[PDB]
Design a protein around this ligand. Structure first.
Ligand SMILES: Cc1cc2nc3c(=O)[nH]c(=O)nc-3n(C[C@H](O)[C@H](O)[C@H](O)COP(=O)(O)OP(=O)(O)OC[C@H]3O[C@@H](n4cnc5c(N)ncnc54)[C@H](O)[C@@H]3O)c2cc1C
Ligand SMILES: Cc1cc2nc3c(=O)[nH]c(=O)nc-3n(C[C@H](O)[C@H](O)[C@H](O)COP(=O)(O)OP(=O)(O)OC[C@H]3O[C@@H](n4cnc5c(N)ncnc54)[C@H](O)[C@@H]3O)c2cc1C
Ligand SMILES: CCN(CC)CCC[C@H](C)Nc1ccnc2cc(Cl)ccc12
Ligand SMILES: CCN(CC)CCC[C@H](C)Nc1ccnc2cc(Cl)ccc12
Ligand SMILES: [Zn+2]
Ligand SMILES: [Zn+2]
Lengths: 230, 230
């Protein structure tokens, strides 16, 4: 026991469907006795841009700015902007990181993309070498809880939008697995705007109910076959 | 001729490999007699976050904030923030939109993700019923010019990262095709940091040379089969 959870939450509106899914996760994980922290990115005005302001120390090469190189070195020297290290502390302490967001352009909203870009730097989240199964966040779990405009039917193989797993690839594999996370099955709450209020309440209750047994779940095999099939 | 091009450019450093690819595109398209415009997102300090500041008027619903609905209505009511409408004007005038960026987490840097989120609103880029082949930007061409850290071999179907086409799906299909663009084959400049000077020169020259005949190209079939098939 004694599990720690970080929820990285990306919605502007506390009364939103995303807000309800975040709150029910806080409620249920709290009820279980888990330690819970939420990064409410919009409320934090979280900075999404990868810039030279993210390093406060002497640059390795002040004539030609290479974000990856400079953040790697800043991580090692401890000269990263404090907003980044504040998030790194939350990740370091977490056993499970839940990302709660509406799908924007088959991906995460930009503010959350910026969290990934800025927080998961070399030295902290991965090394070269030291990625995928050797990533530095090994031993941790991650889970994408996503809401969509499109219906489940629209996000199937035979639909023009394609199977929902297709768009998970850059997030689950390219990012989370790359950093060493084991990835729990995504929670996709399809088309709440189209849904009836009863169907919406059902989707929120389904997430809460799933969370009751989250610590017993196995991760997915985060492979091309899982995402794309044969 | 009389062709118009917008380059949406996302790199912090003018002397970067991305910078050089952007500059060669400007040079070669300018030489051809094309009309060329560049949105240098980092130099513009482009806002990535989707917030209620993106609507200038009174909100469609001041009590509960729905970004998609509010921006749709704002577009119809000419009440979007000027940074967004400035970009929409550039897109509206363009026959070809080139995106020039380094791959960040199998996707675009957050600043460019924010451009997509905030600029391509419903009513402007898509609507009911105009999407995929009938998207509102139909008749326009789009092209992703991406640079990577990983090698071409890492980006193979059975390589650690999977086929590069796998990460293109959310961008080419879920975003560009969705908005009605015809998608020209991506330009992928693999691993310039690792490449020799000569190899880098070759990749820049390949891009310059490609641009010489860009108006003669057929778009790819932006399908699941192209992205995921044998
Ligand atoms: C920039 C942008 C890009 C997008 N790109 C995509 C894309 O690529 N693919 C795609 O499929 N969609 C896309 N969308 C649509 C988007 O994913 C949906 O709009 C979003 O997922 C809806 O979630 P929400 O929390 O905002 O819904 P909400 O509008 O907040 O929720 C709907 C309703 O649920 C109600 N509600 C809240 N809590 C509860 C509760 N506890 N019980 C019952 N009802 C409740 C709310 O009052 C509301 O009426 C995009 C949208 C934007 C703005
Ligand atoms: C947050 C983050 C996430 C990332 N995620 C990924 C990922 O998911 N997958 C992946 O594969 N990579 C990833 N990367 C790596 C990234 O994609 C590469 O670092 C980037 O593409 C390199 O391009 P660049 O323009 O910055 O190269 P640069 O470092 O600017 O350039 C490389 C070399 O080319 C030289 N050069 C510039 N112009 C010319 C010229 N005209 N002729 C010859 N040489 C020239 C430069 O001087 C330099 O020496 C990530 C990086 C970051 C920071
Ligand atoms: C017209 C607005 N309103 C009236 C019913 C319906 C809500 C709008 C719906 C949910 N939004 C969407 C539904 C489905 N797909 C989408 C893809 C993108 Cl990129 C953006 C928005 C999307
Ligand atoms: C000083 C040496 N310097 C090159 C300038 C280090 C370059 C490291 C290499 C290129 N970067 C990378 C190579 C391959 N994959 C990657 C995935 C991510 Cl997320 C981030 C960086 C990556
Ligand atoms: Zn994986
Ligand atoms: Zn397509």
């Amino acid at each position: 026991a004694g599990k720690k959870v970080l929820i990285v939450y990306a919605h502007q509106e506390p009364k939103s469907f995303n807000g309800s899914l975040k709150n029910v996760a806080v409620d249920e994980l709290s009820r279980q006795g888990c330690t819970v922290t939420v990064s409410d990115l919009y409320a934090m005005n979280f900075e999404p841009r990868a810039t030279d302001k993210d390093i406060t120390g002497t640059l390795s090469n002040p004539e030609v700015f290479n974000y990856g190189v400079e953040t790697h070195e800043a991580y090692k020297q401890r000269s990263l902007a404090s907003d980044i290290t504040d998030e790194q502390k939350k990740v370091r302490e977490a056993d499970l990181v839940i990302f709660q967001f509406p799908l924007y352009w088959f991906s995460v909203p930009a503010i959350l993309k910026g969290w990934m870009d800025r927080v998961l730097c070399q030295g902290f989240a991965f090394d070269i070498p030291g990625f995928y199964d050797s990533g530095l966040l090994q031993g941790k779990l991650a889970l994408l809880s996503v809401t969509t405009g499109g219906t489940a039917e629209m996000y199937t193989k035979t639909g023009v939008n394609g199977d929902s797993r297709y768009f998970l690839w850059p997030l689950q594999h390219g990012t989370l697995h790359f950093c060493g996370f084991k990835v729990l099955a995504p929670q996709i709450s399809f088309a709440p705007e189209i849904a009836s209020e009863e169907e919406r309440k059902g989707m929120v209750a389904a997430w809460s109910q799933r969370l009751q047994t989250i610590w017993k779940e196995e991760p997915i095999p985060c492979t091309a076959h899982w995402h794309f099939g044969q």
